[PDB]
Amino acid sequence: GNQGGFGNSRGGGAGLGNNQGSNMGGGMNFGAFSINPAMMAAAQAALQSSWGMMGMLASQQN
């Protein structure tokens, strides 16, 4: 009779899992307006490489 969490979010990533007894359980959760190269692996050997990322990423309220 286990369960997770309870709530609300706006904009951002939210994790509300039941993760009891796991090895890194929960997920990869990302927010709006973003740049995000991503990798998930179960292996003997693993390598990630990334370069050259440009953005404005701005907000105006009138």
Binding site: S49, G52, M54, M56, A58, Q60
Partner: protein
């Protein structure tokens, strides 16, 4: 002789009251990822 280039020229933008992005980028290339 081996060239990679970008040329972007004159921005005329008086009395700006909104939002502008003037973005110029150049990326060399003879990259080689290897997995044996």
């Amino acid at each position: 002789l081996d060239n990679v280039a970008t040329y972007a020229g004159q921005f005329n933008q008086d009395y700006l009251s909104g939002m502008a992005a003037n973005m110029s980028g150049t990326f060399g290339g003879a990259n080689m990822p290897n997995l044996y």
